[PDB]
Protein backbone atom coordinates (compact mmCIF):
# COMPACT_ATOMS: atom_id res chain seq x y z
CA UNK A 1 0.00 0.00 0.00
CA UNK A 2 1.29 3.47 -0.86
CA UNK A 3 3.10 5.47 1.80
CA UNK A 4 0.94 8.52 1.08
CA UNK A 5 -2.10 6.40 1.96
CA UNK A 6 -0.36 5.21 5.12
CA UNK A 7 0.49 8.81 6.03
CA UNK A 8 -3.14 9.82 5.54
CA UNK A 9 -4.20 6.89 7.72
CA UNK A 10 -1.83 8.11 10.44
CA UNK A 11 -3.21 11.64 10.07
CA UNK A 12 -6.76 10.37 10.53
CA UNK A 13 -5.56 8.36 13.53
CA UNK A 14 -4.06 11.42 15.22
CA UNK A 15 -7.36 13.09 14.33
CA UNK A 16 -5.93 16.61 14.38
CA UNK A 17 -7.52 18.85 11.76
CA UNK A 18 -4.53 18.55 9.44
CA UNK A 19 -4.39 17.46 5.81
CA UNK A 20 -1.73 16.67 3.24
CA UNK A 21 -3.22 19.40 0.99
CA UNK A 22 -3.38 17.41 -2.23
CA UNK A 23 -4.42 19.18 -5.44
CA UNK A 24 -7.90 18.52 -6.73
CA UNK A 25 -8.49 16.35 -9.80
CA UNK A 26 -10.83 17.24 -12.65
CA UNK A 27 -11.79 14.75 -15.38
CA UNK A 28 -12.69 16.41 -18.68
CA UNK A 29 -13.21 15.34 -22.27
CA UNK A 30 -15.67 15.10 -25.10
CA UNK A 31 -19.18 13.76 -24.80
CA UNK A 32 -19.30 9.96 -24.56
CA UNK A 33 -15.52 9.85 -24.12
CA UNK A 34 -15.56 7.66 -21.01
CA UNK A 35 -14.87 10.27 -18.35
CA UNK A 36 -17.26 8.98 -15.68
CA UNK A 37 -16.19 5.37 -16.28
CA UNK A 38 -12.51 6.25 -15.86
CA UNK A 39 -13.33 8.20 -12.71
CA UNK B 1 -26.17 5.97 -4.62
CA UNK B 2 -26.28 6.01 -8.43
CA UNK B 3 -30.08 6.20 -8.52
CA UNK B 4 -30.00 9.12 -6.09
CA UNK B 5 -27.35 10.83 -8.24
CA UNK B 6 -29.40 10.56 -11.43
CA UNK B 7 -32.60 11.61 -9.65
CA UNK B 8 -30.81 14.64 -8.20
CA UNK B 9 -29.57 15.59 -11.66
CA UNK B 10 -33.07 15.25 -13.13
CA UNK B 11 -34.77 17.21 -10.34
CA UNK B 12 -33.08 20.42 -11.58
CA UNK B 13 -31.96 19.73 -15.16
CA UNK B 14 -35.14 18.06 -16.39
CA UNK B 15 -35.77 14.88 -18.36
CA UNK B 16 -34.94 16.22 -21.84
CA UNK B 17 -31.12 16.14 -21.85
CA UNK B 18 -30.84 19.56 -20.22
CA UNK B 19 -27.84 20.43 -18.05
CA UNK B 20 -27.23 22.63 -15.02
CA UNK B 21 -23.93 24.15 -13.80
CA UNK B 22 -24.89 23.87 -10.11
CA UNK B 23 -22.51 21.34 -8.52
CA UNK B 24 -23.65 18.15 -6.81
CA UNK B 25 -21.48 18.00 -3.68
CA UNK B 26 -20.93 14.36 -2.72
CA UNK B 27 -18.60 12.79 -0.16
CA UNK B 28 -17.45 9.17 0.04
CA UNK B 29 -15.68 7.54 2.98
CA UNK B 30 -13.12 4.78 2.53
CA UNK B 31 -10.42 3.15 4.68
CA UNK B 32 -7.38 3.68 2.43
CA UNK B 33 -7.97 6.72 0.22
CA UNK B 34 -6.58 10.24 0.31
CA UNK B 35 -8.64 13.31 1.15
CA UNK B 36 -8.96 13.81 -2.58
CA UNK B 37 -11.32 16.15 -4.45
CA UNK B 38 -12.54 14.61 -7.70
CA UNK B 39 -14.61 16.60 -10.19
CA UNK B 40 -16.63 14.82 -12.87
CA UNK B 41 -17.90 17.20 -15.54
CA UNK B 42 -20.20 17.01 -18.56
CA UNK B 43 -18.59 16.42 -21.92
CA UNK B 44 -18.13 19.15 -24.49
CA UNK B 45 -20.78 19.50 -27.20
CA UNK B 46 -21.29 22.02 -30.00
CA UNK B 47 -24.83 21.48 -31.36
CA UNK B 48 -27.61 21.66 -28.73
CA UNK B 49 -29.88 18.62 -28.50
CA UNK B 50 -33.23 18.30 -26.79
CA UNK B 51 -34.10 21.48 -24.91
CA UNK B 52 -30.57 22.78 -24.32
CA UNK B 53 -30.06 26.50 -25.03
CA UNK B 54 -28.41 27.37 -28.37
CA UNK B 55 -25.17 28.38 -26.57
CA UNK B 56 -24.73 24.98 -24.91
CA UNK B 57 -21.15 24.82 -26.20
CA UNK B 58 -20.12 28.03 -24.44
CA UNK B 59 -22.13 27.02 -21.38
CA UNK B 60 -20.30 23.72 -20.94
CA UNK B 61 -16.99 25.35 -21.89
CA UNK B 62 -16.95 28.13 -19.32
CA UNK B 63 -18.75 25.91 -16.79
CA UNK B 64 -15.83 23.48 -16.77
CA UNK B 65 -13.30 26.29 -17.26
CA UNK B 66 -14.37 27.79 -13.93
CA UNK B 67 -13.29 24.48 -12.36
CA UNK B 68 -10.16 23.69 -14.39
CA UNK B 69 -8.50 27.09 -14.80
CA UNK B 70 -7.73 27.23 -11.07
CA UNK B 71 -4.28 26.06 -10.03
CA UNK B 72 -3.63 22.81 -8.10
CA UNK B 73 -6.22 21.20 -10.41
CA UNK B 74 -4.79 18.15 -12.14
CA UNK B 75 -6.47 17.46 -15.48
CA UNK B 76 -7.51 14.06 -16.80
CA UNK B 77 -7.90 14.66 -20.55
CA UNK B 78 -10.07 11.76 -21.69
CA UNK B 79 -10.15 10.97 -25.38
CA UNK B 80 -11.60 7.98 -27.22
CA UNK B 81 -9.47 5.88 -29.53
CA UNK B 82 -12.26 6.00 -32.11
CA UNK B 83 -12.01 9.60 -33.30
CA UNK B 84 -8.65 10.80 -34.53
CA UNK B 85 -6.72 12.37 -31.66
CA UNK B 86 -6.62 15.72 -33.47
CA UNK B 87 -10.31 16.28 -32.63
CA UNK B 88 -9.87 15.90 -28.86
CA UNK B 89 -12.00 18.45 -27.03
CA UNK B 90 -10.10 17.35 -23.93
CA UNK B 91 -6.70 18.15 -25.42
CA UNK B 92 -7.92 21.51 -26.69
CA UNK B 93 -8.82 22.68 -23.18
CA UNK B 94 -5.75 20.96 -21.73
CA UNK B 95 -3.35 22.86 -23.98
CA UNK B 96 -5.43 26.03 -23.56
CA UNK C 1 -0.64 17.82 -34.88
CA UNK C 2 2.69 17.96 -36.69
CA UNK C 3 4.04 21.29 -37.96
CA UNK C 4 0.58 22.81 -38.31
CA UNK C 5 0.35 26.41 -37.07
CA UNK C 6 -1.50 27.18 -33.81
CA UNK C 7 -4.65 28.29 -35.69
CA UNK C 8 -5.21 25.12 -37.71
CA UNK C 9 -8.84 25.00 -36.57
CA UNK C 10 -9.52 28.55 -37.69
CA UNK C 11 -7.80 28.19 -41.04
CA UNK C 12 -9.73 24.99 -41.73
CA UNK C 13 -13.05 26.56 -40.71
CA UNK C 14 -12.32 29.60 -42.88
CA UNK C 15 -11.33 27.12 -45.58
CA UNK C 16 -14.75 25.49 -45.39
CA UNK C 17 -16.69 28.77 -45.27
CA UNK C 18 -15.56 29.95 -48.69
CA UNK C 19 -16.85 26.67 -50.15
CA UNK C 20 -20.10 26.13 -48.21
CA UNK C 21 -21.44 29.65 -47.60
CA UNK C 22 -22.30 30.10 -51.28
CA UNK C 23 -25.90 29.24 -52.09
CA UNK C 24 -26.69 26.24 -54.29
CA UNK C 25 -24.09 24.26 -52.35
CA UNK C 26 -25.35 20.93 -51.05
CA UNK C 27 -23.67 20.36 -47.69
CA UNK C 28 -23.08 16.70 -46.86
CA UNK C 29 -22.64 16.80 -43.10
CA UNK C 30 -20.73 13.54 -42.69
CA UNK C 31 -20.65 12.34 -39.10
CA UNK C 32 -19.27 9.07 -37.71
CA UNK C 33 -21.61 6.74 -35.89
CA UNK C 34 -19.04 5.88 -33.21
CA UNK C 35 -18.72 9.47 -32.05
CA UNK C 36 -21.76 11.10 -30.51
CA UNK C 37 -23.91 13.17 -32.85
CA UNK C 38 -23.71 16.22 -30.58
CA UNK C 39 -19.98 16.32 -31.40
CA UNK C 40 -20.50 16.51 -35.17
CA UNK C 41 -18.49 19.48 -36.41
CA UNK C 42 -20.28 18.78 -39.70
CA UNK C 43 -23.64 19.52 -38.09
CA UNK C 44 -22.22 22.55 -36.29
CA UNK C 45 -21.07 24.02 -39.61
CA UNK C 46 -24.37 23.06 -41.25
CA UNK C 47 -26.40 24.84 -38.57
CA UNK C 48 -24.08 27.85 -38.87
Swiss-Prot record, chain B:
<comment type="similarity">
    <text>Belongs to the TRAFAC class dynamin-like GTPase superfamily. Dynamin/Fzo/YdjA family.</text>
</comment>
<feature type="modified residue" description="Phosphotyrosine; alternate">
    <location>
        <position position="29"/>
    </location>
</feature>
<feature type="region of interest" description="G3 motif">
    <location>
        <begin position="40"/>
        <end position="43"/>
    </location>
</feature>
<comment type="subunit">
    <text>Homodimer; homodimerization is mediated by the dynamin-type G domain which promotes assembly-stimulated GTPase activity. Homo-tetramer formed from two dimers in the absence of lipid. Oligomerizes into a helical polymer that self-assembles around the vesicle membrane, when associated to the menbrane through lipid binding.</text>
</comment>
<comment type="function">
    <text>Catalyzes the hydrolysis of GTP and utilizes this energy to mediate vesicle scission and participates in many forms of endocytosis, such as clathrin-mediated endocytosis or synaptic vesicle endocytosis as well as rapid endocytosis (RE). Associates to the membrane, through lipid binding, and self-assembles into rings and stacks of interconnected rings through oligomerization to form a helical polymer around the vesicle membrane leading to constriction of invaginated coated pits around their necks.</text>
</comment>
<protein>
    <recommendedName>
        <fullName>Dynamin-1</fullName>
    </recommendedName>
</protein>
<feature type="modified residue" description="3'-nitrotyrosine; alternate">
    <location>
        <position position="29"/>
    </location>
</feature>
Curated annotation (Swiss-Prot), chain C:
<comment type="subunit">
    <text>Homodimer; homodimerization is mediated by the dynamin-type G domain which promotes assembly-stimulated GTPase activity. Homo-tetramer formed from two dimers in the absence of lipid. Oligomerizes into a helical polymer that self-assembles around the vesicle membrane, when associated to the menbrane through lipid binding.</text>
</comment>
<comment type="similarity">
    <text>Belongs to the TRAFAC class dynamin-like GTPase superfamily. Dynamin/Fzo/YdjA family.</text>
</comment>
<protein>
    <recommendedName>
        <fullName>Dynamin-1</fullName>
    </recommendedName>
</protein>
<comment type="function">
    <text>Catalyzes the hydrolysis of GTP and utilizes this energy to mediate vesicle scission and participates in many forms of endocytosis, such as clathrin-mediated endocytosis or synaptic vesicle endocytosis as well as rapid endocytosis (RE). Associates to the membrane, through lipid binding, and self-assembles into rings and stacks of interconnected rings through oligomerization to form a helical polymer around the vesicle membrane leading to constriction of invaginated coated pits around their necks.</text>
</comment>
Amino acid sequence: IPLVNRLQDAFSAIGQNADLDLPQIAVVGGQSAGKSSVL
Amino acid sequence: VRLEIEAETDRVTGTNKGISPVPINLRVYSPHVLNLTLVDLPGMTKVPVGDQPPDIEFQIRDMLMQFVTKENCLILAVSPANSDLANSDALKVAKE
